[PDB]
Amino acid sequence: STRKAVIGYYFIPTNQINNYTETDTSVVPFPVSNITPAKAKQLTHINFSFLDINSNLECAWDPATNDAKARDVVNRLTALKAHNPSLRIMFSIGGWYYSNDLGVSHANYVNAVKTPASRAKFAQSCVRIMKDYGFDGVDIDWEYPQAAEVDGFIAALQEIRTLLNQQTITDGRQALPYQLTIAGAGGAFFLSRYYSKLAQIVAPLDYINLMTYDLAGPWEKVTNHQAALFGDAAGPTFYNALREANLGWSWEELTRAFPSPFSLTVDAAVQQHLMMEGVPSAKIVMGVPFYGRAFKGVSGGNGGQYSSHSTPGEDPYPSTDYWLVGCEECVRDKDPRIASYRQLEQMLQGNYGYQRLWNDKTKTPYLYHAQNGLFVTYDDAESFKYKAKYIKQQQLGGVMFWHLGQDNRNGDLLAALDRYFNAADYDDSQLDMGTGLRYTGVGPGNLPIMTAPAYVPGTTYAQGALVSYQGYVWQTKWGYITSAPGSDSAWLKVGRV
Numbered sequence: 001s002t003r004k005a006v007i008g009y010y011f012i013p014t015n016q017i018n019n020y021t022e023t024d025t026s027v028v029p030f031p032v033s034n035i036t037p038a039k040a041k042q043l044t045h046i047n048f049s050f051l052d053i054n055s056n057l058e059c060a061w062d063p064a065t066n067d068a069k070a071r072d073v074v075n076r077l078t079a080l081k082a083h084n085p086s087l088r089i090m091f092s093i094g095g096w097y098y099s100n101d102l103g104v105s106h107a108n109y110v111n112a113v114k115t116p117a118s119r120a121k122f123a124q125s126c127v128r129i130m131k132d133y134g135f136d137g138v139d140i141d142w143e144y145p146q147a148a149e150v151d152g153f154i155a156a157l158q159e160i161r162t163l164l165n166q167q168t169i170t171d172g173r174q175a176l177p178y179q180l181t182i183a184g185a186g187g188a189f190f191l192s193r194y195y196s197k198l199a200q201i202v203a204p205l206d207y208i209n210l211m212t213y214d215l216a217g218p219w220e221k222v223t224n225h226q227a228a229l230f231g232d233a234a235g236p237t238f239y240n241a242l243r244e245a246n247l248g249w250s251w252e253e254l255t256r257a258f259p260s261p262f263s264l265t266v267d268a269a270v271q272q273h274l275m276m277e278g279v280p281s282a283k284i285v286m287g288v289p290f291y292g293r294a295f296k297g298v299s300g301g302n303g304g305q306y307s308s309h310s311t312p313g314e315d316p317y318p319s320t321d322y323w324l325v326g327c328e329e330c331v332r333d334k335d336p337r338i339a340s341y342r343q344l345e346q347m348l349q350g351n352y353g354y355q356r357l358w359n360d361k362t363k364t365p366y367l368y369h370a371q372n373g374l375f376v377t378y379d380d381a382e383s384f385k386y387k388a389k390y391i392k393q394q395q396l397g398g399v400m401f402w403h404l405g406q407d408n409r410n411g412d413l414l415a416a417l418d419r420y421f422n423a424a425d426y427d428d429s430q431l432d433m434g435t436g437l438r439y440t441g442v443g444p445g446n447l448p449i450m451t452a453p454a455y456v457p458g459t460t461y462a463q464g465a466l467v468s469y470q471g472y473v474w475q476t477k478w479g480y481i482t483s484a485p486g487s488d489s490a491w492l493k494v495g496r497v
């Protein structure tokens with residue numbers, strides 16, 4: 001009965017800030033005024049983005065930003081709290097552009113967390129920025145820290161948590177404490193960079209917003225749903241990077257927690273987080289996209305799914321050929337590979353040759369243009385039903401999405417999410433979650449409850465035997481076992497209590 005978080009990103013490029021206006025779409029497509037009172041009430045958090053970490057290793061705005069303008073935009077955002085007292089205006093630091101391994105400011109992130117001094121300096125700048133511009137929390141989107149930088153990242157977060165908590169007291173914000181969150185990897189590959197230390201990373205956070213989308217892209221040889229909730233056996237599968245993380249577990253432990261290959265879905269990412277001890281479901285937030293990814297050069301037979309394609313994976317778009325027919329915004333953004341739900345909705349009702357299909361295993365829609373060989377994977381009010389029920393059933397913290405300017409003018413995707421969680425007249429008790437493939441891995445954090453005869457010191461056990469000891473149920477991996485679980489590596493912990 002705790003309200004589910006609804007975290008929407010508000011992204012505005014510097015040039016739009018420096019020329020902000022709420023009366024001319026050509027310049028500021030999505031002004032703050034578009035976030036009507038109705039919308040502000042369906043949100044719990046708005047992640048204003050993005051800020052960066054400069055060469056000075058402190059949190060800061062983009063140099064070219066006109067400060068007076070920024071503050072005004074921000075103040076328009078915080079002003080929305082007048083409509084919803086639980087609304088928090090967070091500010092996000094990073095994003096793919098600034099922080100990816102090959103990003104412009106990548107070094108600043110690496111160095112910012114290098115030592116206690118840099119950390120305290122960084123942390124202190126985060127809180128200073130928060131207080132100065134009037135934000136309600138700090139969101140850090142480093143995509144992503146690598147194994148050796150993790151301890152620093154972790155220490156930085158703890159530092160930020162300390163300062164924020166102190167600030168909540170100083171500001172008498174007990175009823176709406178300052179918060180700390182991060183955008184987390186939503187796919188095993190990037191997740192494997194810090195997966196072994198999830199517990200420590202999540203400890204200082206109110207939420208970890210999983211970017212459970214972009215699970216398919218033009219950088220992938222076979223077209224696929226970018227945010228399948230569940231797996232489709234007919235779809236591609238992937239190498240389970242997590243089994244290569246520095247977990248220090250045994251072959252048996254790794255194999256049971258990380259089947260491979262596997263289906264790269266939203267369910268897999270959530271379950272992968274829940275497999276680790278100390279990672280509470282309530283802190284896990286499911287990210288969903290308000291845009292679709294388009295591919296060209298697909299062949300028929302499966303409605304464009306799981307087909308080879310001829311889409312360029314480079315960034316920026318290495319071409320001037322805007323082939324996503326009907327997509328006007330794609331021209332405005334010089335990229336036919338991404339389209340907002342808003343634009344997609346228009347394309348569908350526009351007789352452009354697109355046919356909306358539904359994959360009942362993944363529980364997600366897609367578009368197929370038989371004439372031109374196009375495929376678009378995206379989410380909508382229908383896929384969100386399943387994702388919302390999954391969030392409630394799995395007792396997750398809520399939902400996050402990128403980004404507000406991609407919802408249609410009526411704000412339907414946001415309203416759908418709010419409805420599924422809060423409408424007294426909405427009933428999904430009979431909504432069928434389907435037979436799509438579930439992630440079946442088992443780890444220390446999601447061991448099933450079992451019962452077994454207590455271990456008897458000095459007893460010899462055959463292979464496959466089960467016993468209880470030190471709070472867990474154990475099974476032998478082979479025969480003639482003469483020692484106790486934990487002291488004899490012939491036992492596999494398979495249950496709890």
Ligand SMILES: O=C1NCC(=O)N2CCC[C@@H]12
Nearest residue numbers: 095096097141183211402
């Ligand atoms: O960098 C981004 N790229 C698109 C996206 O989905 N985001 C989630 C937060 C980071 C941001």
